[PDB]
Amino acid sequence: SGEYPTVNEIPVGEVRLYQIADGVWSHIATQSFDGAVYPSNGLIVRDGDELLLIDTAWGAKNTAALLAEIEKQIGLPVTRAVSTHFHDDRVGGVDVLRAAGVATYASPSTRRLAEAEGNEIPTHSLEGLSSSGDAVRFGPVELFYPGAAHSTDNLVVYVPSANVLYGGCAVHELSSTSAGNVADADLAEWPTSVERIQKHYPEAEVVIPGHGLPGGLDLLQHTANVVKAHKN
C-alpha cells in the first residue's frame, strides 16, 4: 500500500511496479536461487507513447507476469529492453520478451558472457560502451559503463528528465551489510567504478539498486564501503 515492495508483499509468481518519478517506474519480482528467495529490481521509462524496459524480472514466467502488470498499470507497449549485465536476473526472460515483439539489447560484452554461460541472449549489440566512462543515449535514458564492479560488463542507466540513477547490481541498498553475490565481481576495481558513477551523475536524486530499496546518492558511497569491507 505505497511502501516499496518486498518479497513479503508480492504474491507468488507476480510482479509489482513502483512509481519513481513522472514516467519512471521500477519493477520488482522475486525468485529462488540455490535454495533462497531474493527480490530484484528493474526499470521502466516512458518513451513517448512507448516504454523502454531495463532488465527482465528474473525468469521467463516472472517476465511474462511483468508484461501483464505493465499492461494493467500503464497500458503502453514495451518496444525495447536493455539488460545491464549477463546474469539471469537481467537476461532471464529475454526469450519471452523477444517472442512478445520487444527488441532486446545489451553490450557485446554482456552478449558474449550470456552466450558462454548458457543464459538468454539479447538480440542487438550496444556499441560505444566498451571503455570505462563511456556513455551513449538510448531513447529517454543514458547508458553508462562505469568499469568492472559486480560484473565486468555491468552498465548503469540514468534518466535525465527525472535525475534517476539506476545502478543495477553495481549498487547496493543501504540496509545491505554484504556485497551480495560476488561470484563474478571485481572487488578491487568496484570502488573505482563507483567513484566514476559519483563523478558522472552528481545531480542524481534517486538511486535504485539492483536488489532492494531505492534511496539517494548515499547508496553509492555505501556500496563502496561494503565492497571495501567485504574485500577486507
- Which residues are known binding-site members for Zn(2+)? 85, 87, 89, 125, 127, 150, 169, 211
**Residue 124 annotated to the active site:** no
Q: Does 23 bind ligand YQW (CB under 6 A)?
A: no
The verdict on whether 89 is a catalytic residue reads yes
Annotated active-site residue 85? The verdict is: yes
Distance CA 203, CA 163 (A): 7
Does the protein bind Zn ion through residue 210 (CB under 5 A)?
A: yes
Cell numbers linked to 16: 509489482
> Is 181 a residue of the active site?
yes
C-alpha cell recorded at residue 230: 567485504
Indicate the residue among 210 and 215 with the shorter CB distance to Zn ion: 210
d(CA 230, CA 232): 5
Q: What is the DSSP letter of 4?
A: P
Considering only CA atoms, which of 178, 13, 174, 169 is closest in space to residue 87? Answer: 169
* Residue whose entry in the numeric block shows the C-alpha cell 510482479: 15
Window of 2-10, 22-30, 43-51, 167-175 that interacts with Zn ion by CB under 5 A: 167-175
Quick check: 28 and 40 in contact, CB under 8 A? Answer: yes
Nearest in space to 152 (alpha carbons), one of 94, 196, 193, 115: 193
**Of 50 and 189, CB closest to Zn ion:** 189
Binding mask 71-100 for ligand YQW (x = CB under 6 A): ----------------xxx-----------
The reply to whether 37 sits near ligand YQW by the rule CB under 6 A is no
Q: Tell me which residues touch ligand YQW (CB under 6 A).
A: 33, 38, 87-89, 150, 169, 178, 180-181, 183-184, 210-211
